[PDB]
Design a protein around this ligand. Structure first.
Ligand SMILES: [Mg+2]
Ligand SMILES: [Mg+2]
Ligand SMILES: [Mg+2]
Ligand SMILES: [Mg+2]
Ligand SMILES: [Mg+2]
Ligand SMILES: [Mg+2]
Ligand SMILES: [Mg+2]
Ligand SMILES: [Mg+2]
Ligand SMILES: [Mg+2]
Ligand SMILES: [Mg+2]
Ligand SMILES: [Mg+2]
Ligand SMILES: [Mg+2]
Ligand SMILES: [Mg+2]
Ligand SMILES: [Mg+2]
Ligand SMILES: [Mg+2]
Ligand SMILES: [Mg+2]
Ligand SMILES: [Mg+2]
Ligand SMILES: [Mg+2]
Ligand SMILES: [Mg+2]
Ligand SMILES: [Mg+2]
Ligand SMILES: [Mg+2]
Ligand SMILES: [Mg+2]
Ligand SMILES: [Mg+2]
Ligand SMILES: [Mg+2]
Ligand SMILES: [Mg+2]
Ligand SMILES: [Mg+2]
Ligand SMILES: [Mg+2]
Ligand SMILES: [Mg+2]
Ligand SMILES: [Mg+2]
Ligand SMILES: [Mg+2]
Ligand SMILES: [Mg+2]
Ligand SMILES: [Mg+2]
Ligand SMILES: [Mg+2]
Ligand SMILES: [Mg+2]
Ligand SMILES: [Mg+2]
Ligand SMILES: [Mg+2]
Ligand SMILES: [Mg+2]
Ligand SMILES: [Mg+2]
Ligand SMILES: [Mg+2]
Ligand SMILES: [Mg+2]
Lengths: 149, 77
RNA sequence: UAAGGUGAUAUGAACCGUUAUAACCGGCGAUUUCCGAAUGGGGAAACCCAGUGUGUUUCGACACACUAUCAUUAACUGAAUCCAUAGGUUAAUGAGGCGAACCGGGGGAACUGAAACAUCUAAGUACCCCGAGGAAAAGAAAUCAACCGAGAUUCCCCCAG
RNA sequence: AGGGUGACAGCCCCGUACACAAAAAUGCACAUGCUGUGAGCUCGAUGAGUAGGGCGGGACACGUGGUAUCCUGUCUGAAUA
RNA sequence: UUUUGUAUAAUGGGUCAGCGACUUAUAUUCUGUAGCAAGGUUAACCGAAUAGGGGAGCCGAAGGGAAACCGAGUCUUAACUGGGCGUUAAGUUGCAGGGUAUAGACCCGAAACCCGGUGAUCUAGCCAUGGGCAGGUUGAAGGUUGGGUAACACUAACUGGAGGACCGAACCGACUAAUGUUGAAAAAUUAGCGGAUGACUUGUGGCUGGGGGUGAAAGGCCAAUCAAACCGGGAGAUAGCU
RNA sequence: GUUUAUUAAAAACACAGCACUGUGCAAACACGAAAGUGGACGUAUACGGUGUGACGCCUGCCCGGUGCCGGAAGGUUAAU
RNA sequence: UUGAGCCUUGAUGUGUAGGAUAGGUGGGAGGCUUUGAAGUGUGGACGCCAGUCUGCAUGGAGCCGACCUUGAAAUACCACCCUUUAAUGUUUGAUGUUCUAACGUUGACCCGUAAUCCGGGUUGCGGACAGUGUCUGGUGGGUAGUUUGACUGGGGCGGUC
RNA sequence: AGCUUGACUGCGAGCGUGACGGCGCGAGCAGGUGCGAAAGCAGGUCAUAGUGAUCCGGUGGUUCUGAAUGGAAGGGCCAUC
């Protein structure tokens, strides 16, 4: 019996995969317990329509996420109103909200969850390195300035 | 009776033929099994008296389609 | 339609009628006990016994009506089990049984013939079963033909023992 | 035509040829109202556990034969003008 | 009637009267007869209905060869000096008849085989619920007392009331004989006989159904003939026999 | 005790007793295409089938044939 | 677990001139190293006991190329490979062990339900077995249909055709 | 004893014997052959037993047939089992 898998299933395939299987396995287990469906042509077209529409959403999201990655390197330097203590140490700190809100209202609509700092929250006056995740795998960098209020 | 609720297959008659071509009347019975089908749309199992052939019809069409045939036929399940 | 009538054995009795409710003929109505599908339950057919509702110048039991099963539909209900579903009650509508042959279908003999007998025959006959109609069944080519063509089905005559 | 009448009846009786007739119910027909059914047009669509096949039977005048065609109890199983 | 042969002491008929057995349909061939004649004739159907229409067909005027094929010839064989079958006889359609074919096929007659029903009011076995066994005997186990024994054993009397126990009516059966045998009776009657508290007997109702039942088993019984009941049907089975 | 109702009542059938043998319970077995049922509301000291036939003293030899029970290596061997 | 195919990727060569158990064919001047070598201390496997691959530890600044021989080159390194061998990945079986989910339940329970049927549900026990359908070999007087000759000094036996 | 394959192929006037199916005898004709100088002889064996119809099927051959047509299968014919 050709069937198309719903949830991922051991030794067969992942969601969407097409596989041949013994009828009794499909009939008495995989189908009732919602793990697969027959390989009717309407159904395989359903999923081919699905694979391609999903492929388009992944190509275009990548077209949107790349666009913002060109824009991150486009600004390439940012200022933040930062009350800097004596010697150089910030009375406060510059978080992802602080960085995010600078660049959103300065061009690129970056949410704070996208901002990625290593150790620091930035407690010093100076110019800093900040990288970002805008897609699962496309990343870019701005540089951050700290002007003493 | 020995009747498939899906295909209508039922006993048919015919001959045993010997080597010397003696005909004796016989029957050919369908290959029937009572089987419990999970019907999703009714959160329930339906037990059908089905020939194995009838099982393959249900794999092909889906139990929902085949039960719909049972209704239209007036047959209850 | 009528001058005669009240069926027969079958008289008699008591009566009806003659110009139009005598009788007789035909159409349409009324009444139509009990048994019988028999259908409120039962049963050894023509009988035994109920429930509910109605009626009593007497509101007793007696009388009258309804109450079988199955199917489709609807309303009200309603488990195991949360919803649901089964189930349950009621109502509307239908069916049931009978009966000639022909008709479609599910099953299907044997004697017999073969000069014995088993393949074969008898014969898809006899019979049993289911269902329908005035007819039934069949029916508008995935049919034939034979390089020309025909143009659904059914029946008759040939082809041909 | 036939029957009846005290024996064998065209003309005695009932009939027969021919000509007629329904208050009422009903058949069938054209017409018409009605509730319902949908007409012609364009662009489509074109019947899968099916056809085919293996095994066992059955049906075809055809007894498995070199045996096409049909049905299918059992196991399988296409192409898409 | 049947036989080589029947007065035959072989068959059949008591007699009379009435009935009782070679038919019918369709094919086929021959004879007779009639029509037309190298032609004869139509079938279903149409119909103006025993007419007329209808020539679809059928038989015949051509055979030979397995066939292709050739054709008054052909086949046989490489080919026949030849040989086989043919060429030189008129047919066809009615009508009457003789035969044959298929049909019950001249009439009557089996023992039986198959199918669907009806029967356990007789009888077999079982199930439920009821009834019956006069009278007379025998006297098991157990128990008590006595004797006895160290104690048991044992032993006597008594008590007790077992048993497909004994004798014997009812009741159940059926060993012998006579009678009867067109009976009083399609199984009995008389005199005798066996069982008679039991694996007994019996009433009412129930269940088992025909290749089936039931059978303490005889192929017994299953409604007066059971090695396959009865009724209806296949059915006019078949009958080289009488 | 039973039996050929209707020519046989017997030495025949049955019988208690004996043996063989099947049967673990949804038993074997039997009536039933099946469902259901008897066996049995029993359970191996039970139930079925077969033979023998109270009791006493006993029941020897033969497994080649036929029947049955057990066997897995080898040969042969079905559909497929 | 295992037989028959696959794929990475690792084992393995005594023509003689020799730094000496020369693998053919190519890229071919630097690889290999602290993600830690040369060296010696020992474990294992192969074996022509000449040596080869190789785990562990110790060690700590090298084993290296035309440097010449050799038909063919450096154990600096790299790619398809063969002589053969092992083991991870795969198709089909073979066999087994478990599982649960088809299916069985003539265990207990719940509801339908004042029910020793049935159905649904819960649970326990089994479980791809059992059982059934189609096909197939064997068995099969349990049942069935039949056959089982004629001649003959009757028939049968014998003989005969 | 020498040489040899007439234990030939196609036919057959005319006969015998049979209810029939059949069985037998046969000179001569054509082709081709052996033996003989030649005339000639040879279509098995001195003769008379030594055998099995039909159906179905097998093998080889074939100017036959060949279900639309070309083939093929199957059939026919000849030989044989
Ligand atoms: Mg009533
Ligand atoms: Mg009552
Ligand atoms: Mg009633
Ligand atoms: Mg609820
Ligand atoms: Mg009716
Ligand atoms: Mg016969
Ligand atoms: Mg009617
Ligand atoms: Mg019709
Ligand atoms: Mg055309
Ligand atoms: Mg007179
Ligand atoms: Mg179509
Ligand atoms: Mg077809
Ligand atoms: Mg053949
Ligand atoms: Mg005599
Ligand atoms: Mg005389
Ligand atoms: Mg006499
Ligand atoms: Mg006499
Ligand atoms: Mg007379
Ligand atoms: Mg003639
Ligand atoms: Mg006594
Ligand atoms: Mg007496
Ligand atoms: Mg006595
Ligand atoms: Mg009685
Ligand atoms: Mg008959
Ligand atoms: Mg007769
Ligand atoms: Mg007697
Ligand atoms: Mg006697
Ligand atoms: Mg004995
Ligand atoms: Mg002995
Ligand atoms: Mg054995
Ligand atoms: Mg199995
Ligand atoms: Mg078989
Ligand atoms: Mg046998
Ligand atoms: Mg027999
Ligand atoms: Mg017979
Ligand atoms: Mg004789
Ligand atoms: Mg010479
Ligand atoms: Mg052949
Ligand atoms: Mg063809
Ligand atoms: Mg052709």
């Amino acid at each position: 019996m050709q069937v198309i898998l719903l949830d991922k299933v051991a030794n067969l395939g992942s969601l969407g995969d097409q596989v041949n299987v013994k009828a009794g396995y499909a009939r008495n287990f995989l189908v009732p317990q919602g793990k697969a469906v027959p390989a009717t042509k309407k159904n395989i077209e359903f999923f081919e329509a699905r694979r391609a529409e999903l492929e388009a959403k992944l190509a275009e999201v990548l077209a949107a996420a790349n666009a913002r990655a060109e824009k991150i390197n486009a600004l390439e330097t940012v200022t933040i109103a930062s009350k800097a203590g004596d010697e150089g140490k910030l009375f406060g700190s510059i978080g992802t909200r602080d960085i995010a809100d600078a660049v959103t209202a300065a061009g690129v609509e970056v949410a704070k969850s996208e901002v990625r700092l290593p150790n620091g929250v930035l407690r010093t006056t100076g110019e800093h390195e900040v990288s970002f995740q805008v897609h699962s795998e496309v990343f870019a960098k701005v540089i951050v300035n700290v002007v003493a209020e | 009776s020995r009747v498939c609720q899906v295909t209508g297959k039922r006993p048919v008659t015919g001959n045993n033929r010997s080597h010397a071509l003696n005909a004796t009347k016989r029957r050919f019975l369908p290959n029937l099994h009572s089987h419990r089908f999970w019907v999703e749309s009714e959160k329930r199992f339906v037990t059908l008296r089905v020939s194995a052939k009838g099982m393959r019809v249900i794999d092909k069409k889906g139990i929902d389609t085949v039960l719909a045939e049972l209704r239209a036929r007036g047959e209850k399940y």
